[PDB]
């Protein structure tokens, strides 16, 4: 039930990396997402990231090869920090709140075109106090419940 | 479109993409 939920979230995350929707993640797709979120991975780094989880050596990541990789992760001493790093990526103006415009910008980077209604619904799900923006607590609770 | 699932998926993607 919690595992059912978790696999669906993992499939969603997979689908967000899979920009072209062909059912596999390429090094180019990983690089495009990482750059769009600000970063600068090297070619050597992108290739390493694939090469560790690429169990059949075809050079791309299919969902089992992504799903196994989530099956390795454990709750650790950097678990809460990891969520905080992600929050900081969404919060583009650094005011401590995720606005609708910030959320929409992230989703567009992840190959998703959301309607106004879809972005609103996402804010509503995470917006605890109903002020129309998402605080850090809102964000953390998303990944707890 | 599941708003909850989508937001959790995007956070996980962001976590992976940033470590
Ligand atoms: Ca793809
Ligand atoms: Ca593969
Ligand atoms: Ca902000
Ligand atoms: Ca709020």
Author numbering:
A (entry chain A): 3 to 147
B (entry chain B): 1 to 19
Provide text from the study:
Ca2+/CaM and the E140G mutant were cocrystallized with CaMKIIδ294-315 to gain molecular insight into the interaction. The structural superimposition Ca2+/CaM-WT-CaMKIIδ294-315 with Ca2+/CaM-E140G-CaMKIIδ294-315 showed rather low RMSD of 0.949 Å with difference mainly at the N-terminal region of CaM. Glutamate at position 140 (E140) is one of the Ca2+ coordinating residues in EF-hand 4. Interestingly, in the LQTS variant structure (G140), this interaction is lost and replaced by a water molecule, HOH10, coordinated by the residues I130, N137, and Q135. Ca2+/CaM-E140G–CaMKIIδ294-315 showed two extra unique H-bonds between Ala147[O]:Lys8[NZ] and Glu87[OE1]:Thr18[OG1] compared to Ca2+/CaM-WT-CaMKIIδ294-315. The Met144[O]:Arg4[NH2] H-bond in WT complex is replaced by Ala147[O]:Arg4[NE] H-bond in the mutant structure. Compared to CaM-WT, the variant E140G showed a missing H-bond at Lys75[NZ]:Met15[O]. This structural discrepancy is likely responsible for the missing α-helix between Phe65 and Lys77. The dissociation constant of Ca2+/CaM for CaMKIIδ294-315 (0.052 ± 0.008 μM, n = 8) was significantly increased to 0.097 ± 0.008 μM for the E140G variant (n = 5), indicating a ∼2-fold reduction in binding affinity.
